[PDB]
Ligand binder design. Structure first.
Ligand SMILES: Nc1ncnc2c1ncn2[C@@H]1O[C@H](COP(=O)(O)OP(=O)(O)NP(=O)(O)O)[C@@H](O)[C@H]1O
Ligand SMILES: Nc1ncnc2c1ncn2[C@@H]1O[C@H](COP(=O)(O)OP(=O)(O)NP(=O)(O)O)[C@@H](O)[C@H]1O
Ligand SMILES: N[C@@H](Cc1cccc2ccccc12)C(=O)O
Ligand SMILES: N[C@@H](Cc1cccc2ccccc12)C(=O)O
Ligand SMILES: [Mg+2]
Ligand SMILES: [Mg+2]
Ligand SMILES: [Mg+2]
Ligand SMILES: [Mg+2]
Lengths: 259, 259
């Protein structure tokens, strides 16, 4: 019989597509030698044929999608003024207030894209025609309890349209086309709405105006949504734990690097 | 005559390609109205035609280049254990020790890619054939004095080859092909070498083995280099200050967003 520790080790080495039964009575040392061999070949094939990282590749695919549909690609600071958090209505009452990674006296690691997108919408509205369509992909940081669905360092897609066409129907049509294009199953439940894969939250979307808009100098209708890229990789690759999709030293494209 | 403040305002609005003389005796309010109009049209053209961000686009171009030449694309944590810094030989004697953004008791924002690349080289050497070729693009953080060439939040390309072919000639050939492919003028001065554009440092490269390798479990020859992506955009777009190339709310593709 295998120990819990030995099975822990075997499951790090196991890929969702693997047809191997741990429970069959073969010895740990041999099961481990089989899986070690498969995982080295998986890396060898990636290195020989494609060489692209899942997270980077997904970011590039999402980028082409939104560029093609008319959204301006934004890259804004990751390290943001701590006052952007209070101005988002997060002031020691919300769960998120205690999730902030603080950096100096006045800065933090952004936990969300909304502040920077707000600022870009206000600024670009003096220069661009209606409607204004922007999106950003990049790192976000939140302290979390260990979870199968949570990382402290993750990657968020955020997009926002401001002006005409900001209806809930249009927002659902963007979400629907976007996830059908990546091959990710979902249902939309709900102005605020959530995009869910079973009990896993893929995204939270919203329809404005809302009263928070005036703190940021926004007085137009808008629609938007945020998606976590690692949750999407988790679903499309059927990973059991989101840390196989994360920026990490322990996993490459969901294959363990401790061989 | 224009005030220093009025010329400051005019130069934020001025693009390197602009053929405008501030010194000609026309009034601030009119010079500003001309430049405001040009800068809005620049944004309108980007929004109508391409919609890609300079930093993101450069990252994708560098990615294709290195993937095509056989380097595995890495995305590793940005928030790293503070002990990686001491293990890099930075222990309160180097300039870099005081440039570290510390996050908790035990973590920091990475100022460099070398620790994570080291760890990937050691790990992948059990699985991949010789030579091992990897690269990473992503955020790095250093506290800096205000400068025309320094950002506190920048983007670094790092690449490393381990094993056979790790000669200084091969390393120069990668650097040379890489910068000729992006259209960036340089000279290599020097095993440690620097890639310079005038007095601006584009990159620092190195040839191993070096004694530091054994702390990281490396005992093979290697070659590598690090490049700052914003320094490259600065040179190729002839920006005067690197903050036009940075992830920012003040500039989009080097065009001011305060119109
Ligand atoms: N810690 C995290 N790790 C990975 N993805 C995350 C994390 N937090 C949020 N996301 C993703 O970012 C999206 C938008 O953020 P948001 O709706 O504010 O998250 P959330 O409400 O905290 N979801 P959750 O914390 O799981 O109940 C979410 O729908 C997730 O897909
Ligand atoms: N603060 C910064 N802002 C932008 N790019 C940077 C910064 N620091 C380093 N880089 C880039 O990263 C490359 C590799 O890092 P490194 O050689 O350690 O920098 P460095 O020695 O501090 N250069 P410098 O500080 O300007 O004298 C450099 O050659 C630069 O192109
Ligand atoms: N709330 C997340 C996701 C997000 C990004 C941008 C716009 C959003 C609009 C509605 C709901 C979520 C949105 C964030 O602030 O990053
Ligand atoms: N020293 C920088 C640039 C760099 C990255 C990777 C490998 C390197 C090798 C030699 C010199 C610099 C290298 C860093 O640690 O990120
Ligand atoms: Mg949460
Ligand atoms: Mg939510
Ligand atoms: Mg320096
Ligand atoms: Mg240097």
């Amino acid at each position: 019989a295998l120990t819990k520790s030995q099975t822990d080790r075997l499951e790090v080495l196991l890929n969702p597509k693997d047809e191997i039964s741990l429970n069959s009575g073969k010895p740990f040392r041999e099961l481990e030698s089989e899986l070690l061999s498969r995982r080295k070949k998986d890396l060898q094939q990636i290195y020989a044929e494609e060489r692209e990282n899942y997270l980077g590749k997904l970011e590039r695919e999402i980028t082409r999608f939104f560029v093609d549909r008319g959204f301006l690609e934004i890259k804004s600071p990751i390290l943001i003024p701590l006052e952007y958090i209070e101005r988002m209505g997060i002031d020691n009452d919300t769960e998120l207030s205690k999730q902030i990674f603080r950096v100096d006296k006045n800065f933090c690691l952004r936990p969300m894209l909304a502040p920077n997108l707000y600022n870009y919408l206000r600024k670009l509205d003096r220069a661009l025609p209606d409607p204004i369509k922007i999106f950003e992909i990049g790192p976000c940081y939140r302290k979390e309890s260990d979870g199968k669905e949570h990382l402290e360092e993750f990657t968020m897609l955020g997009f926002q349209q401001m002006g005409s066409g900001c209806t809930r129907e249009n927002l659902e049509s963007i979400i629907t086309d976007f996830l059908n294009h990546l091959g990710i199953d979902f249902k939309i439940v709900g102005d605020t709405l959530d995009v869910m894969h079973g009990d896993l939250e893929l995204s939270s979307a919203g329809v404005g105006p809302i009263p928070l808009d005036r703190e940021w100098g926004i007085d137009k209708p808008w629609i938007g949504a945020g998606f976590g890229l690692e949750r999407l990789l988790k679903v499309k690759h059927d990973f059991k734990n989101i840390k196989r999709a994360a920026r990490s030293e322990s996993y490459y494209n969901g294959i363990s690097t401790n061989l």
